[PDB]
Amino acid sequence: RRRVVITGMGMLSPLGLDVPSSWEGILAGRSGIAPIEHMDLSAYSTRFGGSVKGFNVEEYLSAKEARKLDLFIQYGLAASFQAVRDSGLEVTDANRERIGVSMGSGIGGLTNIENNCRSLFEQGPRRISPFFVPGSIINMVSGFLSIHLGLQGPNYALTTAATTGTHSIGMAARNIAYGEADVMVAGGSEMAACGLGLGGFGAARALSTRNDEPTRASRPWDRDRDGFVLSDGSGALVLEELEHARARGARIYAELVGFGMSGDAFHMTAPPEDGAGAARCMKNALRDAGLDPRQVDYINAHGTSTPAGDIAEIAAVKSVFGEHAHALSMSSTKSMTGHLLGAAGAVEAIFSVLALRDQVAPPTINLDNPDEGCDLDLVAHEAKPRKIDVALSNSFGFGGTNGTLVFRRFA
Amino acid sequence: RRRVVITGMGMLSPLGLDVPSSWEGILAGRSGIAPIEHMDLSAYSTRFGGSVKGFNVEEYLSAKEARKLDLFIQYGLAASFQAVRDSGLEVTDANRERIGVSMGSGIGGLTNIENNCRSLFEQGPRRISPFFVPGSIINMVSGFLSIHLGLQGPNYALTTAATTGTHSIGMAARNIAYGEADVMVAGGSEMAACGLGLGGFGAARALSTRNDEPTRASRPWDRDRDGFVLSDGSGALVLEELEHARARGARIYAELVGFGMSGDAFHMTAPPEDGAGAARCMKNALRDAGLDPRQVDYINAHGTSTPAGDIAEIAAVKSVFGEHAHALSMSSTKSMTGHLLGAAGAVEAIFSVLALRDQVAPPTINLDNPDEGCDLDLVAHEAKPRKIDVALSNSFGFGGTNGTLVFRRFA
Ligand SMILES: C[C@@H](C(=O)NC[C@](C)(O)CNC(=O)c1cc[nH]n1)n1cccc1
Ligand SMILES: C[C@@H](C(=O)NC[C@](C)(O)CNC(=O)c1cc[nH]n1)n1cccc1
């Protein structure tokens, strides 16, 4: 198997329109959560979220190209283009077949679908845009990126709910490790802040309803947590075979050493109380990386601020790590970003890599009163400078689908 | 790399509610295309499609479980359960972590989304089902199958438009080949026969409008073709490591020897006139299988009945195969099934395997007047008994995303 490194990153989040601005917000403990301004939520039990603020798609695409595309595609292209520029890669005839893309989404073009349903029910099907299908389907981040950059390698898209971004990165790394590509652009994007997203997750009783204090709503492992916060944005990494990166003199951020997957086979929406599937997933990723649990310094948790999910993640970590569970640091950056759904794993992979670059564990904000059994170093309130050699990133989604990535400082 | 075999298959199609009934229809040249009965299409320019007829979800799930699930999930579970039963596999504690699932969809829960949008716009968000999100997202075929069967291996879902089923199978085979699982259930499902699907593809000018003769509408490579026919259903294969299959005495249908992927990097919806991306994809799959072009006997074409797509596929086949393009047989079973979208590749993989089992090339019906350059053996009108050692199945989707599978008779 060939070695895989991160040579470029890109991001839109509720904390900023790029990686450096987002990361500054993470290290300062800033919330990106606010009352939603783009629609009237007076009828909904949740009125707040993590929006992308002041995005200008015209930095990335012509107005012509942009009007064809759902927001989730615009977001994923923005992250993708930032990552590719950050990488310094030049696409040529000699490499274009060796560069692919894997950008996914959990829910995809839900805003576009809702707007076209309005036109459909009001006026019938003659109002539907000719770009409705290609502008709304999940694989069109991969599709549009490949067209705009001339990328002819593996072209595909994952959709594994909250695990999408984690699985997108891990399977892209697998493509490189086994020789099917030299470079992959991988990550996820999401914009599900529409009536169907807020209403759908509200009907499932999944969302925090703390409308009076939006910045306090996302509180992973806190005893007064009451559901996740819905957030929008995107993350993309340029993954590259090590020798390919070395030959062109690329800046390497970190090594992607391990990827694990598992299924709980338990319940559509609830995890097993012991987090046994998350445990098997973490162990699979450590095994894949050739690492003992004791070499892990930082975990970027799934940590969504749900009652059952957060405690099941602690139980999984205690099972995998044992006494070393009390030496590592684990935090949820969802405390600040909210839950970006299919992009969560992509942005959290970026935070894990930056934790490696900067030797700092990002905080879990809002962790006022840790719940029963939440007795690990959860980095409550303030960022923590420390030694980080190995950083792990977890995502667990609906259907019991689990993914873990393992990043290492490179040498 | 370990060897991968097909030990089980399952299907819903416009030709029948299982594999044997569907295959009987294929070999007889029967169309599954008819005026749609389940909604009023008087306002739409296309009023016909490939529906699933007389499906009883209660053969597979309780009424309780079924009411939570979009039709595309019901379809994918039905195919999946048929495939698993067909395989004879017994799931135990010793193997459950080694059995995963990869069932995708191009469009996913579009019917559910449209019905919930009606409730939303009429009555506000209190009408939205609590099962709306878990019952509508694409990864819930994989999710529900894993829960119902206790499968704890890799759990994920592809969404690559018309390539979904092809990519789902090929990446599941990759998981087995490189030791991440012993068994995978892989395929795709689709039910996009709603106002948004028919209206969306109609707005894109993608659909045949031959409402006067629905059974003649799908006519791949015919000079009077005018777009594809939208169809519903599902296909699932049980993929298994060879030694695992041999040890339990499984019936092996065929070997999955090759998988190729490529991106055109050309256009969101149009292929390059020379089919250069499809050419690279086929070559990648043959290279992967260790096969010369001359060993290919049967191609199950993408062959959707579009002007540009069908001729670009011929040009790709002539480029890859050369003079051997005139010795192989190539047909589109979309002539009879229509275009099942994200399930197309799954059902077509099953037809390719059965072409191997039965030594018969299925027909391209409706091929009355082959267009300029469509001078290969396209199996016009009637099934053709012949030697088939190697069968190839193509899918090409929006975004320029391409996949090819290569199946071989097993020994
Ligand atoms: C019960 C709750 C929830 O939090 N579910 C979590 C989920 C989606 O199953 C994913 N798994 C984990 O978080 C996890 C943690 C350790 N092992 N698995 N809910 C959400 C929506 C409706 C109810
Ligand atoms: C132009 C036409 C169409 O048929 N497009 C085909 C597509 C979706 O690009 C996939 N590629 C191939 O069929 C192919 C064949 C050989 N190489 N690629 N259309 C569809 C919807 C709107 C217009």
Short mmCIF file of C-alpha atoms in Angstrom, two decimals, chain A residues 261-265 280 284 399-401, chain B residues 2 7 80 83-85 87-103 142-156 172 175-176 179-186 237-241 244-245 248:
data_model
loop_
_atom_site.label_atom_id
_atom_site.label_comp_id
_atom_site.label_asym_id
_atom_site.label_seq_id
_atom_site.Cartn_x
_atom_site.Cartn_y
_atom_site.Cartn_z
CA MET A 261 -15.75 1.64 8.83
CA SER A 262 -18.45 -0.31 10.63
CA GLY A 263 -22.23 -0.68 10.89
CA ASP A 264 -23.97 -0.81 14.29
CA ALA A 265 -26.81 -2.97 12.87
CA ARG A 280 -15.19 -1.51 16.26
CA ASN A 284 -10.48 -0.86 12.59
CA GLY A 399 -28.51 3.69 9.69
CA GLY A 400 -25.70 2.98 12.17
CA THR A 401 -23.01 3.84 9.59
CA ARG B 2 -8.55 -11.84 -3.66
CA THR B 7 -23.37 -15.90 -5.22
CA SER B 80 -31.34 -7.05 -1.23
CA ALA B 83 -30.13 -11.61 -3.24
CA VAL B 84 -29.24 -12.70 0.34
CA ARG B 85 -31.80 -15.58 0.26
CA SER B 87 -26.99 -16.63 -1.84
CA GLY B 88 -27.85 -19.14 0.97
CA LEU B 89 -25.53 -17.20 3.35
CA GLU B 90 -26.10 -17.66 7.08
CA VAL B 91 -25.10 -14.56 9.08
CA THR B 92 -23.35 -15.55 12.44
CA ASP B 93 -21.17 -13.90 15.14
CA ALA B 94 -18.07 -15.24 13.32
CA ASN B 95 -18.90 -13.49 10.00
CA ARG B 96 -21.23 -10.51 10.72
CA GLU B 97 -18.36 -7.98 10.88
CA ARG B 98 -17.17 -9.33 7.46
CA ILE B 99 -20.54 -8.75 5.69
CA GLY B 100 -21.35 -5.20 4.52
CA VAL B 101 -23.64 -3.32 2.18
CA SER B 102 -23.37 -0.77 -0.59
CA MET B 103 -26.82 0.03 -2.09
CA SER B 142 -27.72 0.02 3.45
CA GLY B 143 -28.84 1.16 6.91
CA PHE B 144 -32.14 -0.83 7.07
CA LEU B 145 -30.56 -3.94 5.46
CA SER B 146 -27.74 -3.98 8.01
CA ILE B 147 -30.24 -3.65 10.91
CA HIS B 148 -32.63 -6.34 9.58
CA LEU B 149 -29.81 -8.86 8.83
CA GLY B 150 -27.29 -7.95 11.57
CA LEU B 151 -24.56 -6.94 9.06
CA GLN B 152 -21.67 -5.04 10.74
CA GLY B 153 -19.15 -4.68 7.91
CA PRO B 154 -18.65 -1.64 5.63
CA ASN B 155 -21.91 0.25 5.36
CA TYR B 156 -22.23 2.98 2.74
CA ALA B 172 -18.09 -3.41 -2.99
CA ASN B 175 -13.71 -3.98 -0.46
CA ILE B 176 -13.61 -7.78 -0.79
CA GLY B 179 -9.68 -7.78 2.64
CA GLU B 180 -12.05 -5.16 4.21
CA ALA B 181 -15.01 -7.62 3.89
CA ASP B 182 -15.74 -11.23 2.82
CA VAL B 183 -19.31 -10.53 1.60
CA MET B 184 -21.01 -7.38 0.27
CA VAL B 185 -24.60 -6.79 -0.80
CA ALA B 186 -24.36 -4.19 -3.58
CA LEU B 237 -25.87 -8.79 -5.90
CA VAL B 238 -24.20 -10.79 -3.15
CA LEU B 239 -20.50 -10.44 -3.86
CA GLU B 240 -18.28 -12.94 -1.99
CA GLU B 241 -14.57 -13.77 -1.69
CA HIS B 244 -15.33 -18.05 1.42
CA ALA B 245 -17.87 -19.14 -1.27
CA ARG B 248 -19.57 -23.14 2.38
#
